[PDB]
Amino acid sequence: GFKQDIATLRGDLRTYAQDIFLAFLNKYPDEKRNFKNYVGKSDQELKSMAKFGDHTEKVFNLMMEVADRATDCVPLASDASTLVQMKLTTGNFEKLFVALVEYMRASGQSFDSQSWDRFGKNLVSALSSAGMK
Numbered sequence: 001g002f003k004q005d006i007a008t009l010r011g012d013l014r015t016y017a018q019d020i021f022l023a024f025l026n027k028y029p030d031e032k033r034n035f036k037n038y039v040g041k042s043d044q045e046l047k048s049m050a051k052f053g054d055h056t057e058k059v060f061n062l063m064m065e066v067a068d069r070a071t072d073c074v075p076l077a078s079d080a081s082t083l084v085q086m087k088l089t090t091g092n093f094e095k096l097f098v099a100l101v102e103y104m105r106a107s108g109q110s111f112d113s114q115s116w117d118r119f120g121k122n123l124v125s126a127l128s129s130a131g132m133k
């Protein structure tokens with residue numbers, strides 16, 4: 001289920017983070033235009049940029065922490081507030097989770113893809129309730 005999936009992702013987090021973020025950028029090319037440093041680069045070129053691997057892993061680590069603290073795929077409102085108060089839009093987040101769920105469904109592994117869909121919706125809603133546009 002959802003909690004085992006957190007363990008699965010953590011066990012190869014850099015690879016999963018990069019591959020899911022690349023799936024997001026390739027599914028939504030316009031989002032990539034908000035990453036000036038990644039425009040005009042293929043997957044393999046992105047994987048050679050230090051801050052691509054470092055930033056994608058850091059984002060997914062925080063996602064895993066929030067997932068770990070959630071109950072029934074509902075994140076803590078206090079985690080959402082911490083996120084909004086750290087240095088975006090709920091629309092871009094919703095698109096990341098669409099790509100994440102599609103990636104899980106195409107994997108041969110028994111990810112709980114419906115729970116991640118719910119978690120993404122609930123995080124988007126909690127971020128909006130906590131003041132993110």
Ligand SMILES: Oc1c(Cl)cc(Cl)cc1Cl
Nearest residue numbers: 021051052053055056059
């Ligand atoms: O370099 C970044 C990456 Cl790869 C992903 C996100 Cl979500 C943000 C930044 Cl600044």
